[PDB]
Amino acid sequence: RLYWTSLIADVEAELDAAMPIRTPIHSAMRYAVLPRAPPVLCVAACELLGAPREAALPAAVALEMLHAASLVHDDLPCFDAAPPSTHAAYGTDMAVLAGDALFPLAYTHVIAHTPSPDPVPHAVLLRVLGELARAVGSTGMAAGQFLDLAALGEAEVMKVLTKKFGEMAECSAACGAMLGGAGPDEEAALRRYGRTIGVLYQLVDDIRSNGKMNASVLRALGMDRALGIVEELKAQAKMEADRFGDKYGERVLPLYSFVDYA
């Protein structure tokens, strides 16, 4: 529902006051997280198990910063090479340097809010920091981007979304999870949801495409299937979501249907 809209507006406000103009590159960062669906999944997933949220807002903010950091790096010139750019605005020079400042910005905003004392004892915190780092690490996303540097068509070779667009919401779910006290039984359970809800939004969208950025599915293979993977990811996701009992999980579902369509 619009609920999502509310969350997004709040995220935007904390971010602005997180990045202040002070000196120096700073001007450049703001024009990278300024100029769906990873962050919000997390707050709401976090709401589950019933945790005061101000506890998950920092995670959402860190998440958008992380998305942007590797965003800048994905439409850098030495990647796709075909058309305003966050890199061609301040120079490919500062562009690099910027995202390199955004990674530690997340982990810093995370440690600052995401109040450690009271709820969210630190071990949980390290787990969260590790999750975000892993999410953008060699294992996921960077591998996803690397895979997606052009070949493209494979039956199961074609699932780079799973690492490029998949393992970004995977943590975003798993992040929410640990924040409010999720059990391991619900650890991969909640995280299984993330992987396959990240693919959904992207996989659906590769019909019309300001976002993040080859190796698309439709071009790659029979649409009937593309259209077919959709239910297969809807159904799977729906299974994992259903695990949950003792609603409200009404909200955890609409995420699956918002995707179809904006």
């Binding site: 590797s70 030495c78 990674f103 590790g130």
Partner: peptide, 15 residues
């Protein structure tokens, strides 16, 4: 681009 993603993987890896 590999050099780009290699720094990005490390940064993360370190944290």
């Amino acid at each position: 681009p590999i050099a780009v993603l290699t720094g990005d993987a490390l940064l993360s890896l370190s944290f």
